[PDB]
Paper text:
Plastic pollution has become a global environmental challenge, driving interest in enzymatic polyethylene terephthalate (PET) recycling by using polyester hydrolases. Metagenome-derived polyester hydrolases, such as LCC and PHL7, have garnered significant attention due to their high activity at elevated temperatures of up to 70 °C. Their engineering led to the development of optimized variants, including LCCICCG, LCC-A2, Turbo-PETase, and PHL7mut3. , PHL7mut3 has been designed to improve the activity and thermostability of PHL7 by the Q175E, L210T, and D233 K mutations. In this study, the PHL7 wild-type enzyme and the improved PHL7 triple mutant PHL7mut3 were expressed in E. coli and P. pastoris, and their PET-degrading activity under various conditions as well as their thermal stability was assessed. Both the PHL7 and the PHL7mut3 sequences contain three putative N-glycosylation sites (N143, N144, and N161). To assess the impact of mutations and glycosylation on structural folding, we used X-ray crystallography to determine the structures of PHL7mut3, expressed in both E. coli (E_PHL7mut3) and P. pastoris (P_PHL7mut3), as well as a non-glycosylated variant with three additional mutations (P_PHL7mut3_ng), also expressed in P. pastoris.
The crystal structures were resolved at atomic resolution with the highest resolution of 0.89 Å achieved for E_PHL7mut3. The E_PHL7mut3 crystal belonged to the C2 space group, while the P_PHL7mut3 and P_PHL7mut3_ng crystals belonged to the P212121 space group. Structure determination revealed that P_PHL7mut3 and P_PHL7mut3_ng crystallized with one molecule per asymmetric unit, whereas E_PHL7mut3 contained two molecules in the asymmetric unit. In the P_PHL7mut3 structure, electron density supported a single conformation for K233, whereas two conformations were modeled for the same residue in E_PHL7mut3 and P_PHL7mut3_ng. Very weak density indicates multiple conformations of K233 beyond the Cγ-atom in these two structures. We therefore consider the observed flexibility of K233 in the other two structures as characteristic for the enzyme in solution. The difference in the catalytic properties of E_PHL7mut3 and P_PHL7mut3_ng might be caused by the N143Q, N144Q, and N161Q mutations. The C-terminus is quite solvent-exposed, located at a distance of >35 Å to the active site at the opposite side of the protein. Most likely, the additional LE-linker has little influence on the catalytic activity of PHL7.
Residue numbers in the entry: 2 to 260
The structure:
Amino acid sequence: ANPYERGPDPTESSIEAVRGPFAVAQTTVSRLQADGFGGGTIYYPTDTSQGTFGAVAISPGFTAGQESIAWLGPRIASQGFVVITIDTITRLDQPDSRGRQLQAALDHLRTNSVVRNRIDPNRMAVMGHSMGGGGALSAAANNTSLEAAIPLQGWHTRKNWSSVRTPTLVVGAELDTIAPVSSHSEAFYNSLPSDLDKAYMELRGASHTVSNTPDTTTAKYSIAWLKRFVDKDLRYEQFLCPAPDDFAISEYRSTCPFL
């Protein structure tokens, strides 16, 4: 058996859920307490009876606060993850700095008494929007032990990601004019190793700012990806392979099967 499985057997509806199977609580990390990032909020399951959980750090993009990604916090954590949504040190931080801050936010979780006994420190992931998604890729390139990476409309000047060894779901917005998929998202996907477990999911009609308010497609497939790779949870392969059928996805590419 897989000792990392948490929660009831899934369905498409369970991964679409705004509130997942786990009740969640939250704790604030002040800027002063946050070594190497701008503070944040940690969302976590309060039920400890199924074991420890993997951890996820999420960064906003250029000019943006934690509030632009906050909705992902409880929506993902309630599926069985400890999730920290960060503020960056400054609103103008670039992608590589954001990648350092994502790693610093994960590292913080190991030290914070409210959650350190709730995490499996070996099973961690990074996500982010815009330059924060560039940051997620940078963090993965710097730490091949990360179990998943999910850039959402990622922006980066670095286009070649051949050194990444972390399963990566690249979420593009079809009509993105800030981080256009042809030169950002889908170029990143194409330069990830061909033998990596990876997928490219393009959101039909979406603008760059799609991740700044709730988007069910983004949440459901982020949850499925995190389950499949952070928890090695084979119950979630069904949602990723073969390609998802949602209208909201204009294009899907992957290295399925991952099994």
